Design a protein around this motif. Sequence first.
Motif, PDB file in Angstrom:
ATOM      1  N   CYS A  13       0.833  -1.375   0.018  1.00 28.89           N
ATOM      2  CA  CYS A  13       0.100   0.052  -0.146  1.00 28.89           C
ATOM      3  C   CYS A  13       0.722   1.198  -0.134  1.00 28.89           C
ATOM      4  O   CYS A  13       0.483   2.284  -0.777  1.00 28.89           O
ATOM      5  N   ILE A  14       1.831   1.106   0.854  1.00 31.46           N
ATOM      6  CA  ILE A  14       2.749   2.656   1.058  1.00 31.46           C
ATOM      7  C   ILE A  14       3.754   2.810  -0.141  1.00 31.46           C
ATOM      8  O   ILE A  14       3.957   3.893  -0.456  1.00 31.46           O
ATOM      9  N   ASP A  15       3.958   1.816  -0.967  1.00 35.85           N
ATOM     10  CA  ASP A  15       4.845   1.883  -2.292  1.00 35.85           C
ATOM     11  C   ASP A  15       4.225   2.078  -3.486  1.00 35.85           C
ATOM     12  O   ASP A  15       4.952   2.435  -4.449  1.00 35.85           O
ATOM     13  N   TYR A  16       2.733   1.841  -3.547  1.00 42.25           N
ATOM     14  CA  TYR A  16       2.068   2.112  -4.577  1.00 42.25           C
ATOM     15  C   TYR A  16       1.754   3.456  -4.751  1.00 42.25           C
ATOM     16  O   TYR A  16       1.647   4.065  -6.195  1.00 42.25           O
ATOM     17  N   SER A  17       1.549   4.119  -3.769  1.00 44.38           N
ATOM     18  CA  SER A  17       1.465   5.459  -3.701  1.00 44.38           C
ATOM     19  C   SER A  17       2.795   6.260  -3.744  1.00 44.38           C
ATOM     20  O   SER A  17       4.001   5.583  -3.606  1.00 44.38           O
ATOM     21  N   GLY A  18       3.002   7.495  -3.860  1.00 45.51           N
ATOM     22  CA  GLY A  18       4.126   8.353  -3.819  1.00 45.51           C
ATOM     23  C   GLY A  18       4.654   8.280  -2.348  1.00 45.51           C
ATOM     24  O   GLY A  18       5.415   7.304  -2.024  1.00 45.51           O
ATOM     25  N   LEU A  19       4.650   9.431  -1.746  1.00 42.20           N
ATOM     26  CA  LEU A  19       5.043   9.557  -0.330  1.00 42.20           C
ATOM     27  C   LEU A  19       4.086  10.323   0.380  1.00 42.20           C
ATOM     28  O   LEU A  19       4.124  11.177   1.090  1.00 42.20           O
ATOM     29  N   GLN A  20       2.831   9.916   0.375  1.00 39.62           N
ATOM     30  CA  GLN A  20       1.677  10.081   1.431  1.00 39.62           C
ATOM     31  C   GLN A  20       2.016   9.420   2.914  1.00 39.62           C
ATOM     32  O   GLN A  20       1.504   9.968   3.709  1.00 39.62           O
ATOM     33  N   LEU A  21       2.522   8.186   2.814  1.00 32.91           N
ATOM     34  CA  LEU A  21       2.786   7.607   3.944  1.00 32.91           C
ATOM     35  C   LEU A  21       1.639   7.067   4.954  1.00 32.91           C
ATOM     36  O   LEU A  21       1.764   6.058   5.176  1.00 32.91           O
ATOM     37  N   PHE A  22       0.601   7.932   5.166  1.00 29.77           N
ATOM     38  CA  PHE A  22      -0.589   7.683   5.988  1.00 29.77           C
ATOM     39  C   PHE A  22      -1.640   8.018   5.360  1.00 29.77           C
ATOM     40  O   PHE A  22      -2.656   7.436   5.662  1.00 29.77           O
ATOM     41  N   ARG A  23      -1.759   8.835   4.356  1.00 31.28           N
ATOM     42  CA  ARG A  23      -2.685   9.082   3.557  1.00 31.28           C
ATOM     43  C   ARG A  23      -3.376   8.147   2.342  1.00 31.28           C
ATOM     44  O   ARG A  23      -2.438   7.680   1.775  1.00 31.28           O
TER      45      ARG A  23
END
Lengths: 69, 55
Positions: free
Chosen positions: B28-38
């Motif tokens: 989940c965290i690597d699929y998105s950019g750098l939201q981290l918690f969003r």
Amino acid sequence: XXXXXXXXXXXXXXXXXXXXXXXXXXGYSMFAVGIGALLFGYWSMMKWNRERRRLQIEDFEARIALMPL
Amino acid sequence: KLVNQCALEFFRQIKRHCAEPFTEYWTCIDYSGLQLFRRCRKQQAQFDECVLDKX
């Protein structure tokens, strides 16, 4: 029999009638919606920035937690 | 020297017990950019709950 151009007026097309009139906006009522949208605007925006603070502290906590880095 | 040795001790405990919620959270965290918690808080609910069984 003589046939010529006949006269017809019927409604007379209304000689000089005003079409321009005040619509939708009144004056004082527009300021209630205008400034009302501003007060609703800030209150909705600042609550998101308080929710951003929940993420903000948690983001900087990752740096403090990582010491093998 | 003790820092890096304890670092291996932390990750091994998660790999032994409750590995399925950890791998899904990592994807989940690597699929998105750098939201981290969003846009990953829904998948975060699966995490911690399995870890709560342990101390």
